[PDB]
């Protein structure tokens, strides 16, 4: 029924028009003032694009963006059934942040993270509702990707489970359940994936280019791994990459040398205007 | 120029078929005429499935199959100007053959083997031509599919290199370069994604067809990893990471014990029946 | 209920005991008559020893000797429930009795191996029965331990483990699941901590007795490793360690140099007067 | 010739050696930095040496005549004529060599300086003062006044006279000691942590369940306790904090501690001691 | 290039700035103090006289060589070098300041070369906006005799800025290799791990301290044995070498044995020391 | 004292050479007439080098080779002191000559083995004088390389080891004391170093040149890695981390696959006329 998303940025934003765009009643929380904007900004903007576009009316722009309530105040949470965080991907605001919802919210609040990196039942372990603590993964861009990883965390119910899996398929998205485990599904393939191209590459095996064909033309996969690699940002190719060699402490996963020497240049792919290509 | 494919199996009769098609002389050979004549027979069920779905006319399969010549004596190779071989077999008769046809071979011919596991530098080394052998690396189906690894053993000389990328794009594909390495590009970054997914599956974090879910969903790829599994062969699965393991000698590319339970079993996917799911 | 054990060695003469001391005709197969009468004469003195110390009655002996039949006729097999093969462990042969068994019996019969290192699996994909396939794995003597590890290949019905299990109970033991994995639960566990004895010996961090004094009065353990590993035979423990690291492929389980030292030596522990101690 | 000891550490594991010793005829002091502290360590004996009088083990008498030969303290100068220091306080290096150092100045140029560290370097703690030779380990078992093990730790600059000397110290106080020359673990963490380890990356393949790993154990290796049981009994935390150092000392991958470990820790399921770890409680 | 800023007036930087001195180069010499300045500056004279008494140069060639040295705290004294050789051992966030501050005071041709092996130099160019122009010039002690310099170039090093510093390399009398930025580079990445594998041997008892060195001196023709060499080059700098190898790798073939660490933690570093595997 | 050396190839033939010219009756055995004599000329034309540079005398050259007798016939190795086999690289066919020795030769026969990769140990183990059985390691060519690696069985007796010891130098050499372990000492460092420079190469660090001429100048080494490595002949060095991977079980000694590769190609180094340098053309 009604939802609190912390952190209006690019995840946070999305998220927020997802759940709005199905008839769910919205806060939208951020630190300050401008940067709540900017997430209504880019909600706007993109709900523009799809009138533009003739897939929905303006006047389901408009009922979508009623629905959300911009605030810079945490306490606005405390009457929701749900809460999805999407702040800053440090384990100290998000224990910080889930301790304090904790005493905020109505004991019935579901709290979710959309952390891609971090422990959600460590994040649990701050509350004293570990049983309502869960992952709710979203893919970029929000709005559209239809997949969540449900992540459940050692101490998630399967009431919580539930409850978070209907309102998944209720927002039109498609979940999956993950015991939590360094890089949920997704991640945990297709990171190393890139990596192993780097590993091609840095031996001088084949070049950028014909690694990326190659997987394209041999595997049916829509981009490259180097391509993808620029896509999804170098920084944070290696971030996770580091993540999956710190939680397993095995060898297999680590990251490149020559994936560190891209990023330590700046060179993160598109974002920054060149990676392993030049844009 | 004039073509010799050694094997009349499916990718052999595959090959010979899409030089056929673009207008050059092809001598198909295998071991004793029955072989021979099923790779034909295969070809024309090609041809005439390609006639129905309306690609060509009757005339061109009949000009194509003209181009075409059965054999099972290796001499025919002798003016040849490439000889493609795709018999599946041990590194001791494959020597044997490439030794075979050094001999028999005008000066000018260059001897490409169609081989995933085993080392083109190696085979290279049986010949007194070491300079003109290479790897030609074709997907099934062989007609269609547009990728050709192009795999360099250290002594493929530049020429040898550069006439079979031009032939390759002569026969409506698009070649990629690649020095000789376990797994090349296609399965060194492929076989290992497969292979996390069976460590995914077997620590309980998701199921078979939350896996495959999410990749689809989550990489827009068109199949899992296990479902994609199941339809190479996990047999095939296993033994790709075999040879990458074997060759690196980094338990990185360790197979899966979960693997080698299916594989021991007989639940190889599509093909018996039964793999990650059953069919 | 009609048992047969095939391997009138220790193992195998053990197990025949325990099945016909708990009420069960049990039929004794090995490949020639000295090999049969040595395992029911090494029966006979087990009884004879309990006799002697008050444990069973004279009668009850006589009994139990009653209830075990020495053949060299594989074809005895043909009627019993339960077949326990306990031959030395030897994958084509190992594979050739369950074939062969698979013929003979019928087709209630469940086809048991005592093998601690062959894979269930593959075993009964040697068979058209592979949910009637199954470990049951004993400790040394079988007559007095407790424990049995029931192994489930990956095609193992509930329903013949259900049986097995009651089985196991039925003789007095204390059967636990499995499914099938590398060293299954004490091997897995017990083999490694010998391994890790070896190698703080092997770095003169402490001597012999040192390390399994720490054990036994740190640990509460009866026996210290390096003992332990002496008591089991070291060439015994070198060949679990074997299959471990070549299973897994993970060199978390590599044998250390210094146990291979060892047992090239032929000093294998209590067996041959000499391993880690002098005997 | 040892005869007055100083435990440094009045918590579980400090005021159980000082108990140790306090029964065996040493003069003992037990330092701490707040009255609290030593307070708490003094009842702790106490209540231990009280369950001895009523198991019928020992005199209510014996157990008076123990505790007067222990006098707590929080002045560390009292440590000064001791024979014997044996530190059992927080696990931080920084802070551990700073006791050392001023024990170092301290304590007449008899007195050995031991600790009863698991996780960190004897060796690098008698670096931090001017008498190498006279540091050493010192390792007890929970409960330090009946486990007889003593793991005796012998840095590299460790002497033979400095060993000789714990080792027939410990014989004199009824302890079993063994000689382990620094590494990762000693030999029981080293050897043990690891099958805990082992037995939760079974658990986690679903290959066998809690209670059949356990069994297994107890039943196939004759052992009085399963490994997960055996995580639980010990404290999960402490399991994953050992796995932690081995891997970090040795570098091997040998030694990573299972993710599903780390899982249960996160989760605050750290056995007995939380009502909750493999086992409910 | 005309003139070269040399930053630190220790023993590698004071041998730095001789060997280009006496190649006709100007050289400014920078420092944090006077003190430290001074200190390099009689370092050098030193060496000089050395060559001078021993019969290699003349006195006037000696004098020649140390006016062409100019002393100086002030970093903006840089400012028209067209080389400037950061040679101080330094933390990674100090480095980068440093070079920060080069990117804004110096002349936009001047290339910006460290020294120093243990970090990464495509990590320090980051922090200025010529990346280009940044790269690593690596002397071997002593500066002033030894050859080989291994020049590292970070992923942004552009052929330009290398051909310079490969041709002002051989000007001063060196022997430059290319080295794309790596763990180790070539020379540490293959014989500290060397020394490491000694370490090892000794641990499991195979054979004592002197039977290794004796055995790779004999049977390899080494100059050193790795243990010695180990005491020679101090163990603790062998050890934090093999901790940026795996810590950069991640890959436990370059774990630094547990002995190693044992020897280190013990002040026992070798002949800094008078005590690492060998009594000095 | 009278020794038999097993093989009259190139360790052999210079082996029996080294001890004839320090005074040893020398027994050399091969399987054909022709191997003997082909063994035999190797030895001459060697001292005729050392006549014809004024490093011995003409005399010296008759008396060495006169100290010398081929033959074909094992059982001249009955009553020698010493016994080194220098003949093939095999361990079925180790233990066989080894198994046959201990048969034929009297008791106090010590039999040594000059095998850089198989073990002592199991050789040893396929007689029944396990404490005679020994490695005695020489280096090419063994008349001048004065390195000679002593490999202890676990069964080697210390009275077997000063006897070889005693030997190796009473024939001018330096002797080492090396408790088996693959590689021993020096193959166990050196031959990784040059497996190391193989990866820098392949990952495009630097060139061959590059690699060489850093690991020269900064190392002060004779000959840089890769060139060393055309040198010793990479199959042996392939083979050599072959051993190292097998018998560690350890990854950090893997083969790099470039090393695989130019060995695939019969880029065996100088032997073959290429190897990561030219040399034949
Ligand atoms: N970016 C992606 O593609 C992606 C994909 C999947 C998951 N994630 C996860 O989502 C999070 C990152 O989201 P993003 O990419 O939108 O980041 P972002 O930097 O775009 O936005 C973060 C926002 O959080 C706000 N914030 C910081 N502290 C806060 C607090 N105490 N309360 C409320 N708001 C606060 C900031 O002001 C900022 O607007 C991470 O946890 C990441 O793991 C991101
Ligand atoms: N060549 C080297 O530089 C080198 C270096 C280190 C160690 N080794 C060791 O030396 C041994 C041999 O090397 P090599 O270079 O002399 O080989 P080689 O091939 O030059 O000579 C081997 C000789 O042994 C003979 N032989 C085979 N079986 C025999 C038998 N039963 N009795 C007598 N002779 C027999 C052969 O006829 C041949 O003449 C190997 O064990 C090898 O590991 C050699």
Redesign the interface.
Same mark, same amino acid.
């Given at each position: 029924k009604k939802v609190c998303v912390i952190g209006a940025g690019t995840m946070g934003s999305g998220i927020a028009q997802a759940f709005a765009a199905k008839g769910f009643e919205v806060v939208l929380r951020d630190i300050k003032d401008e940067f709540v904007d900017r997430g209504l900004d880019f909600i706007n903007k993109n709900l523009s694009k799809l009138v533009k576009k003739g897939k929905i009316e303006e006047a389901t722009k408009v009922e979508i963006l009623t629905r959300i309530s911009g605030t810079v105040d945490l306490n606005m949470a405390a009457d929701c059934d749900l809460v999805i965080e999407a702040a800053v991907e440090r384990m100290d605001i998000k224990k910080q942040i889930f301790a304090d919802l904790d005493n905020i919210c109505k004991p019935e609040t579901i709290l979710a993270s959309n952390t891609s990196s971090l422990?959600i039942?460590?994040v649990?372990?701050a509350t004293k509702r570990?049983d309502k603590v869960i992952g709710m993964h979203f893919?970029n861009p929000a709005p559209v990707?239809?997949?969540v990883?449900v992540i459940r #965390? /050692? %101490?998630t119910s399967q009431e919580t489970f539930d409850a978070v899996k209907e309102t998944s398929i209720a927002i039109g998205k498609?979940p999956?359940?993950?015991?939590?485990?360094?890089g949920?599904?997704?991640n945990?393939?297709?990171i190393?994936?890139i990596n192993?191209?780097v590993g091609?590459l840095?031996? #001088? /095996? %084949?070049?950028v280019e014909?690694?990326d064909?190659?997987?394209k033309?041999?595997?049916?996969?829509?981009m490259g791994?180097l391509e993808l690699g620029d896509f999804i940002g170098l920084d944070i190719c290696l971030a996770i990459m580091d993540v999956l060699?710190s939680?397993?402490?095995?060898?297999?996963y680590?990251?490149h040398?020559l994936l560190?020497?891209?990023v330590?240049?700046?060179?993160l792919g598109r974002k920054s205007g060149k990676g392993f290509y030049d844009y």
């Open positions: 422990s039942t460590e649990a372990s570990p893919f990707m239809k997949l990883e #965390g /050692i %101490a498609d999956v359940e993950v015991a939590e485990a360094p949920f599904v997704v945990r393939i297709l190393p994936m192993e191209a091609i840095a031996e #001088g /095996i %084949a070049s014909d690694i064909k190659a997987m033309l041999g595997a049916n996969h829509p791994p060699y939680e397993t402490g095995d060898s297999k680590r990251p040398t560190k020497k891209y330590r240049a700046g060179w």
